[PDB]
Each structure stands twice: as C-alpha cells, then as structure tokens.
C-alpha cells in the first residue's frame, strides 16, 4: 500500500504521508482504518522512530501526528534514556521545552491544541524523572520565573507541577525503585516553599482558567505537603469563601477541601480546631447562599441532571461525609456550633434521598459510622434524634429486595419469579439492615411507630402499592433481633394480623403473590417468635405446604426456601412431641411427604428432604434417629430397591432415559439428606453402598459402550450425560459423607477399598473426554480425611490418576479446566498428608511431579497457580524435614536450581503478577536453605569449582549468570548488588519483597543505579 511508505527508514520521512496515515486512522473507518492502525503501530515501535520526532514536531500539520511523536519519545525516555549520548539528551530536552514555550505563546494554539500541550507536559515530566534535580537544578526557580512573564505559560506551568506531583507521590510506588522515589520526594519537598509561594500568589491575585489549573495542582499537593502550609496561611479562608462562590472554581475547591479534611493535624491544638470548624462553617454558608438551601429537593435536582449538578452533588456528599466522620466531635459540644452540625446533616439526609445506588452507598457508609458511634458514645444520641428519625424513613422507604424474596415485577406489570439472582444488591441489603438495626436500638418506639403506621396506610389503601408493601415488609423482617422478646411478641402479632387482613382484601394472583412473598419473608425472619408459638409455627408450615401446590412458581419456590430457613432455626420444635399433639411434627411430615411434594420440581423435593434431615439430626438417641432416617428414606429406598432388582437382571433397562432420571433423583435425594445429616447418615449409606458401587460400574460400562459405538460425540448426547450424572452424584454422595464422617475406622475398613476398586481403573482406562473430574475431587476428600490411615491406597490413587491426568492438561493452559483444578488440589493434599506416596514413585514419575508443579505456577488461573506455589513450598518443607539422607541430597542436586530458576521466571515475566507474594516466599525459602547451610551436599559437581567452596558462593555465581543471560541489558554491578541485597534479606520477607520489586523496576529500563539495592 501507498501508506506503508513511512515504514522504510532507508528513505527520508514523508511527513505529508504520515499525516495521511494518521488521519486515515483517527478519521477513517473499516479496512483502511485497520491497515492504517497497523502501519502506525509498526512505525511507532521502530527502535529508531524517535529520531524522526523533531522532524514531525517541526513540520507536521496534524496534532495527532505530533501526539504520536511524543509517545515515541516517551518510550525512549522511560526505557532507554541513559543509553543516549549526552548531546542527544540535551537536544531532546531543549526541543521539548522549546515546543512547550512556543505553543503557549501562540494563544490560538494554546486554546485549540490542549491535548498536544498536556502530552508535551507529560513528556517533559518523564524527562524530569530521569534528570531532575541532579542534572537540572534550576528547573523550579526558572519555571517560577517564567510564570510571571505570561498568563498562558503560568497556567501551563501549573499543569506541569500537577503532573510532576502525581508522578512522584501518587504513582511512584509501582514505577520507581524505593531509592529513586525517595530521592524525587525529597527533591520536591526541598523546593516546595517556592512552589507554594507562586501558588498562593496566583490564588490571591485572582483569569478563571489559571485559577482552576492552580487549584487542580493544589489538590495533588494536599496528598503530601506539610499541614502548616494549609493552616498557617490564609489559604483555608480563600478556599472556603472566594473559590466556593464561582461555579468554575467550586468543583475543584470542594475536592481540595475534602482532601484538607484529611491532612495530618495535631489533636490538642485549640487554634487548629478553630480553623477546621471555620472552613466548614464558611463552606456550608456558601452552599446555602450560592447553591441551594437545606430544604431543597436534591432528589429532583439530581434526576434533572442539568450541567454538572450530579458531580457537584456527589462531591458535596464526599465532602460532608469525610469531614463529619473525622470532625463532627468538634461541633457537638459548643451550643453555637449546633445549627451547623445539624444543617450539615440535613444536607446529608437530602443527599440520601437521591436515586443513585452508588451515591446511596456513600451516604449509607456515613450513616453507619454515625449510628455505630451513637450506640456507644455517652450523651450523643439526643443531639441527632431528629436526624435519626428522618433517616429511619429514608432507609425504610429505600430497602432493597433481600436474597430470599424470589418474586419481582416484570415490564408487563405481572409479578413473576426472577430469571436470575440480583447478585449486586446482596451487600447493599446487608448495609441497610445494619444501619436500620442500629436506628431501631437508638429509638425502638419511633421505629415501631413509623412501621406500624406505614402498615396502617397500606390496609386503609391510602399508600397501597407493591413498592410500598414490599419495602415495609423487607424493613420489618430486617430488624429482627432488635426488640425484646416481649415487644417483638406484640409487634409481630400486630404486623402478621395486618398482613393477613391485607391478603384477604387483595383480589387476584399478582396481589396474592406479592403479599404471600412478604408474609413468608417476615415469618422466616422471626424464629424466636416461632419457637415460642407452636400453634402458629405449625399452621405456618401447613400453609407453606399449601404453597407447594401453587401454580405460581415464584411462590412455590419461596415456600420451599422458607420451609428450610424456618427449620434451620426451629428444628427442635419439630422433633419433640408438643403439648397436646399426638406425635412429633416430623412424623406427620414424613408420613405425608408424597402428597406434600407431589407438584414440586425434583430439586425442590431434594431441598424438602434436606430440611427433614436437619430435624432428624436433632434426635440424639441412636435407635430413634436411625428409624426416623429410614422412614424419611422410604420412597427413595423403595424406588431404589426395584431399580436395583430390575437393573441387575437386565442391563438394558438401565438403557431407558426415564430410568436414568429416576436413578439420578434417588442419589440426589441421598446427597441432600447426607448434606444435612453428615455423620448420622451412615446407616442409610450402608443400605445402598454396595449396590450403588455396582451401579457405578454398570453405568461406566454403558458409557464406554456408547463412546465405542457412536464416537466421542456420544459424551454430548442426553443419554450419556444422564449416565455421567449418575456417576457424578454417586461420587458427590460418597464425598459428602466422608467429608463429615466421625468414624474414620469405618471409612477405611468398609468404604475405601470398594470405592477405589470401583472408580480408579475406570477413570484410568477411559478416554480423556470420558473421564470425570469429580473422581479427583472425591479422592482429595478421601486423602484429606483418612489418607494417613491408607498409605497404600494413596499410592494406588496416584498410580491411577497422576500420569494420565497430567497428559490431559500439559499441552496448553485451557483444555480440561475442571480436571486441571481438581488435579492440583489432589496433589496438594497428597503432598501435605501422605508425602511417603511421592517417595515411592519411580525417578521418572517424580520428575513429572516436579514438572507438574512448575507447570502449575505458569498458569494464569488462580485456582491452579496458588496450589502450584503452595505445593512447591510444602515440597521443600517435606524434603527439608527429611534431613541429611540420600533422597534429599539427590532432590537438591536434581531440582534445587529448577525451582529457583522457574520461580525467577514467573517473578520477572510480567504475566504472573497475582502470584508475587507466594513466589517471593518460595524464593526466600530456597535462598534461605543455602544461606543457612541446610543443603548437605555441593549443588555443584566437582571440578566445576574448588573443592572447599560453599553453596552460597556457587548459588551467587549461578544466579549472576542466569540473570546476566536472561536480562542482558543489565550491568554486572546491577546484578551483583541485587543478588547481595536479596541474599542478605532472605530472613525478612517485607524487605526481600521490596528488593524484588526494585529489580522488577530496573529490568524495564537501562542504566538503573546499583546503589538502589542498598535502600533501607
């Protein structure tokens, strides 16, 4: 293409062609934009492209061309600056400074080319980071001098200083060594008095854009400057009065005052206290007179979203909440400051009515901070009684749907079951509940009165709406635990009586669904009440059972969830015989279980059975418990027994899709009950166990047969997915039981051998796509719980899953994601609980183990990566614990340097930043092994180095070589100093990590200072 001409550096640069490529990129579209983009990227990445920058800057008629020229220079300056000969450095600095001066002096350019100028200023700042103050000591005095000369130049200087303060104080942590950052912080600190003088002068003398630029720079300084600059000058007065009045400066001044409300400031000093009160007082008076009174409808203002109102309101909220959180104590004692305190809070009340979730969270965080303080601090709550009373209203009327309420309104005005969970309101609900709980404790009478009377207006119909009955109901449920049992008694009674009244009066299925969701939520939130009112509890449950036959699927699902919620708390009352009842309610429930659950979806049936298991485990007498368990299991066990008889006689019957569903639901029912009963489930497990393992084998044969007959595509078919579900649920059941078992001798004597026999060879001898990841998961739990008791079984597990699973996952990082994850979990527990199993591996298999570990920590998957690093660490500890024996000596000779170099590789490649902490920990461990002479053999083979030589000397030599070849742009000195520091710091993780971070900075550039590694 014509456009590709700029890529030939053997020919002189056609600036007109560059400008065309650039225009085509930014202003073009389609294929031409795409071609032009590639060309510009190739151009920009040419390691000589920077030599063209002056030419472009001088001759280009295109601002974007010149921007791109400045990016090319920025890259040179931040990575290879110290490579250049000194006259190129001076030359680059001169034409950058000169371009800035020149663009500022031409007003039309200043007005219209802001992007370019800002980019120039950043480019200058990158030069300062390299050169200042050591090779540019007059930069600041001269900048100050230049400022007075022109208003455009002065404005721009403020931008330069803002960017410099940012680069040095706010963004230096990740981008500079500790030593260099300190250097630059000290340098800026030493010159600040003169910068401040210029700043204050500009602010005092009052052009609006110059003032705004100066205030934006001040905002940055407030992050770090000494407090005397803020409190001992007249700057607070200016900020809180003059700069609040004009809307041009008001936005940034408010942000400055928010930062000021955070300065480090003495706690005993009465004058500073007076000044902190005064700036707030001024600020609030300016808002009231220039912006809006305390009575103004901010909800409405925000919704209108005129001009910059939303951001202003956001900023006011941040200012008020920040200031009051630190300083409201200053305003609480003096009666003359009371009006200010209460007005500031009244603004917050108004801000809290705004419909904007993220803003609500900001204000709510502040309310929590306040109400928590009022709960504990003597003599405070009365000050805020009216603020609190208003807050009670705001929270109650803006309560968000809790996770339990499964009905929602659709766009068609129908109350439907939710499609998905409102995952993003979980936390908001919790925060709202927390505040409302405090508010209720602060005045329980006020809260009752607000709620009961809001309810009154729902019955009578005056405020009736779904929105209003909902938030009220959620609010009411949310304060459970805040009242005395006795007041709670009367309160709940009142609320429930009224919600019942409400239901009767509300014709239609959408109304009934809303009101039923609300009643179910409230009753489920008050178990203390339920435990005290048996007739009521029982009638509630019978009613939940009625809802299990509802055609409205939202109500039905909620009934199930509410049933288990109530049972989790009230289970004792279902297990005993209540006065004046003929049997424990659990007996009544079990008996009618087929009727009750007839219309439920299977997973709802399983939840039901799980609830019953919770009750049954309350019975501690073993004979009675087991009988309850076998009663509960009657229907699944009868279905099971006929399935087993049929299946054994003819394996074709297992073929049927309907039978496969039936079997899966049987096992799932067992899982559900086992989950709630844990160790108490054993007798039921015993009833099915041997036949269940026979079923696993039968199903396994069917799956293999189908894959042989239809191909791998078989694994996608509904038939085969149905058969694997059986296998997975069987593994889940066994896993669930073993994870909770208390009799481990029975696990080992009775459960394990048949389990291993049934699952391992089957897993091993299946094609990869037919292998179930859940086998590995099951085996992890087995090793976790009883691995120490079954050393030979652990050997068998490794033999069966290790090599074949590794070969599935060692081609790339993406295939078989579940296997990958379960595989490293299993290796982790084996390494932790039955290390002997690895000691028994043949040498080739052990190498693959080491390979597997190193492969793990090259993953970007966190699941895997984290386990890989932990295994490596645990492995080193395991080797170490063996002491001076041949296996350990051989492990070091073979593997110490593989681990060191592999760990360095992931530390330094920039694609494994999430693992830094654990990587650093592993490296420190490995280095400390040599430092402390815990390696008993030479790591070096003999004649590689003199006979008496130490591993410490050899380790340094090995590392210096490794690093010299991996990072050839580093000097020898840099490498030596880095290694000296790292080895010295190998007992102090915090410092050790700083040194690693410093190295990661230096490898990104040329000519880093080796003395940086002496930082302390």
């Amino acid at each position: 293409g014509a456009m590709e001409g700029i890529l030939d550096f053997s020919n002189d640069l056609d600036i007109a062609l560059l400008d065309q490529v650039v225009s085509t990129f930014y202003q073009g579209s389609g294929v031409q934009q795409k071609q032009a983009q590639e060309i510009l990227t190739k151009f920009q990445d040419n390691p000589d492209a920077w030599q063209k920058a002056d030419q472009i800057l001088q001759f280009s008629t295109n601002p974007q061309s010149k921007f791109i020229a400045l990016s090319i220079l920025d890259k040179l300056i931040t990575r290879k600056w110290k490579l250049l000969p000194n006259d190129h450095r001076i030359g680059i600095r001169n034409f950058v400074v000169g371009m800035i001066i020149s663009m500022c002096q031409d007003d039309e350019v200043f007005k219209t080319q802001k992007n370019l100028i800002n980019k120039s200023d950043l480019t200058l700042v990158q030069i300062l980071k390299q050169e200042w103050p050591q090779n540019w000591p007059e930069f600041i005095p001269e900048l100050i001098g230049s400022s007075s000369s022109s208003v455009n130049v002065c404005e721009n200087n403020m931008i330069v200083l803002k960017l410099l303060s940012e680069e040095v104080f706010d963004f230096s942590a990740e981008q500079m060594t500790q030593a260099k950052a300190l250097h630059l912080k000290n340098s800026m600190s030493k010159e600040f008095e003169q910068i401040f003088k210029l700043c204050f002068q500009v602010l005092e003398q009052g052009s609006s854009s110059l003032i705004v630029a100066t205030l934006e720079s001040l905002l940055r300084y407030l992050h770090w400057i000494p407090y005397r600059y803020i409190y001992e000058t007249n700057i607070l007065e200016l900020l809180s009065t003059k700069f609040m009045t004009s809307p041009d400066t008001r936005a940034i001044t408010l942000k400055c005052l928010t930062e000021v409300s955070n300065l480090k400031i003495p706690q005993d000093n009465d004058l500073i206290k007076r000044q902190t009160v005064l700036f707030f007082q001024n600020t609030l008076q300016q808002i009231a007179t220039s912006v809006m009174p305390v009575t103004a409808d901010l909800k409405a203002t925000y919704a209108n979203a005129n001009g910059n109102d939303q951001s202003f309101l956001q900023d006011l909220a941040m200012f008020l909440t920040t200031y009051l959180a630190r300083n409201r104590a200053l305003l609480e004692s003096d009666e003359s400051l009371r009006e200010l305190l209460l007005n500031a809070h009244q603004y917050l009340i108004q801000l809290s009515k705004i419909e904007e979730r993220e803003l609500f969270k900001t204000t709510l965080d502040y309310w929590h901070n306040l109400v928590a303080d009022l709960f504990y601090e003597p003599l405070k709550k009365h000050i805020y009684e009216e603020i609190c009373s208003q807050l009670r209203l705001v929270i109650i009327e803006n309560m968000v749907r809790p996770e339990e309420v499964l009905v929602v309104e659709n766009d068609e005005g129908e109350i439907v079951r939710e499609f998905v969970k409102e995952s993003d309101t979980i936390q908001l609900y919790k925060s709202e509940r927390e505040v409302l709980v405090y508010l209720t404790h602060l005045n329980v009478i006020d809260t009752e009165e607000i709620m009961i009377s809001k309810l009154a207006r729902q019955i009578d119909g005056s405020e009736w709406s779904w929105h209003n009955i909902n938030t009220l109901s959620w609010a009411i449920g949310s304060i459970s635990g805040t009242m005395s049992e006795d007041t709670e008694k009367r309160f709940v009674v009142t609320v429930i009586k009224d919600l019942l009244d409400l239901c009767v009066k509300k014709r239609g299925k959408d109304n009934k669904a809303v009101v039923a969701s609300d009643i179910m939520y409230v009753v489920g939130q008050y178990p203390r009440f339920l435990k005290a009112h048996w007739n009521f509890l029982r009638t509630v449950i019978l009613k939940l059972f009625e809802f299990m036959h509802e055609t409205h699927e939202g109500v039905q699902d909620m009934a199930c969830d509410t049933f288990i919620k109530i049972v989790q708390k009230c289970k004792y009352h279902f297990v005993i015989q209540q006065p004046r009842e003929s049997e424990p309610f659990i007996q009544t429930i079990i008996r009618d279980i087929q009727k009750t659950t007839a219309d439920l979806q299977p997973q709802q049936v399983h939840t039901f059975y799980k609830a019953c298991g919770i009750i049954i485990s309350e019975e501690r007498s073993v004979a009675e418990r087991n009988r309850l368990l076998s009663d509960l299991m009657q229907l699944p066990n009868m279905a099971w027994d006929t399935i087993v008889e049929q299946s054994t006689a003819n394996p074709t019957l297992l073929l049927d899709s309907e039978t496969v569903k039936i079997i899966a639901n049987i096992i799932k029912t067992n899982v559900a009950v086992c989950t709630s009963m844990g160790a108490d489930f054993y007798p039921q497990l015993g009833h099915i166990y041997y036949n269940m393992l026979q079923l696993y084998r039968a199903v396994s044969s069917m799956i293999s047969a189908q894959v042989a007959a239809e191909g791998l595509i078989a694994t996608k078919t509904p038939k085969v997915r149905g058969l694997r579900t059986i296998k997975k649920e069987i593994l889940k059941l066994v896993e669930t039981y073993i994870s909770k078992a208390r009799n481990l001798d029975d696990v080992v004597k009775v459960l394990v051998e048949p389990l291993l026999n049934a699952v391992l060879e089957d897993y091993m001898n299946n094609v990869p796509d037919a292998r179930d990841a859940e086998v590995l998961n099951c085996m992890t739990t087995v090793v976790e719980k009883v691995g120490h008791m079954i050393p030979q079984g652990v050997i068998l597990i490794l033999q069966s899953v290790f090599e074949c699973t590794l070969d599935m996952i060692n081609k790339d990082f993406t295939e078989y994601p579940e296997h990958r994850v379960e595989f490293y979990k299993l290796l982790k527990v084996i390494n932790e609980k039955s290390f002997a199993a690895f000691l028994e591996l043949p040498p080739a298999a052990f190498k693959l183990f080491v390979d597997a570990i190193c492969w793990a920590f090259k993953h970007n998957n966190r699941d895997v990566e984290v386990n890989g690093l932990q295994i490596a660490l645990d492995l080193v500890k395991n080797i170490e614990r063996m002491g001076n024996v041949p296996f350990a000596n051989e492990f070091h000779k073979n593997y110490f340097f593989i681990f060191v170099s592999e760990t360095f590789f992931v530390l330094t490649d920039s694609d494994h930043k999430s693992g830094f902490s654990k990587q650093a920990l592993l490296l420190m461990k490995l280095i400390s092994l040599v430092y402390d002479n815990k390696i008993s053999v030479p790591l070096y083979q003999e004649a590689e180095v003199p006979q008496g030589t130490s591993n410490q000397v050899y380790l340094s030599q090995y590392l210096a070589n490794m690093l010299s070849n991996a990072f050839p742009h580093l000097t020898s000195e840099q490498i030596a100093s880095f290694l000296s520091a790292l080895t010295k710091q190998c007992k102090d993780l915090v410092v050790f990590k700083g040194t690693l971070r410093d190295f990661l900075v230096q490898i990104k550039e040329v000519g880093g200072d080796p003395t940086d590694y002496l930082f302390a």
Partner: protein, 131 residues
C-alpha cells in the same frame, strides 16, 4: 367558564399466536461451532392483512431483533445431537441484521415440553402459511 387545561414496533398489525422464552444460535460454517445470537421471547406473529405467520425474537433488555423470518412450509425442525430440548433448521431469508441472509439456526428452550410445544406450534403455523 371553561378553564383551558395545561397542554413504532411494526408488530402493530399482528396477532401473537405463540410466545416462549428461548436461546437462539446460528451455525458458523467456517469454524464448526454454534454461536449464540440472542436470548428472549420467541414470538409467532400472524399478520391480520395477509394471514402470513412469522417468527420474531428480540433480545432481553436491548430488545434487538435476533430472528425475523417467515415460518416457511419447506422448513423442517431437526434434533441436535447434544440436546433433547432444541431444534435445528435451515432458514433462507432472515432479516434480523438487515439484508436477507441464509442461516442454519438452532433454538433451545427451558424444557423438552417447551421444545415439543414449539414444534407443534411451528408446524401449525406452516399449515396457516400454506392456505
């Protein structure tokens, strides 16, 4: 004395024969894989003036059309190897993304029941489009 008081979907002319939630896929031939095209309500729309019946499907929230084509009599609903709750069929003239393009579609439902109800209703609409 009277006081003066203070001061298009294109589905307007159609009858909704049938509505069901669905996920729609299209088969990318070059890479042999299905790609999701949308999730939402799949509607059978019978035009009051022509008695002709179309499939119209819009994505949740954005309400963008992901299917708009006549339920052709020549079309046939086929099972997919992986599913007991989907149909695959070839469509020669879909106008969801502008100009009429041919596609192989797959449409999946919440249950086998819904898939079966869909097919029944799909063949009913084919007969209507015959008359």
């Amino acid at each position: 004395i009277h006081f003066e008081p203070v001061v298009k979907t294109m589905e307007e002319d159609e009858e909704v024969l049938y509505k069901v939630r669905a996920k729609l896929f299209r088969f990318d031939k070059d890479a042999k894989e299905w790609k999701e095209r949308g999730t939402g309500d799949c509607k059978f729309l019978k035009n009051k003036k022509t008695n002709k019946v179309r499939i119209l499907m819009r994505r949740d929230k954005t309400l963008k059309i992901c299917a708009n084509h006549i339920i052709a009599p020549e079309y046939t609903l086929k099972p997919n190897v992986g599913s007991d709750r989907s149909w695959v069929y070839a469509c020669t003239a879909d106008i969801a993304e502008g100009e009429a393009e041919a596609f192989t579609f797959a449409i999946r439902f919440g249950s086998k029941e819904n898939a079966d109800k869909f097919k029944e209703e799909f063949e009913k609409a084919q007969e209507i489009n015959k008359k």
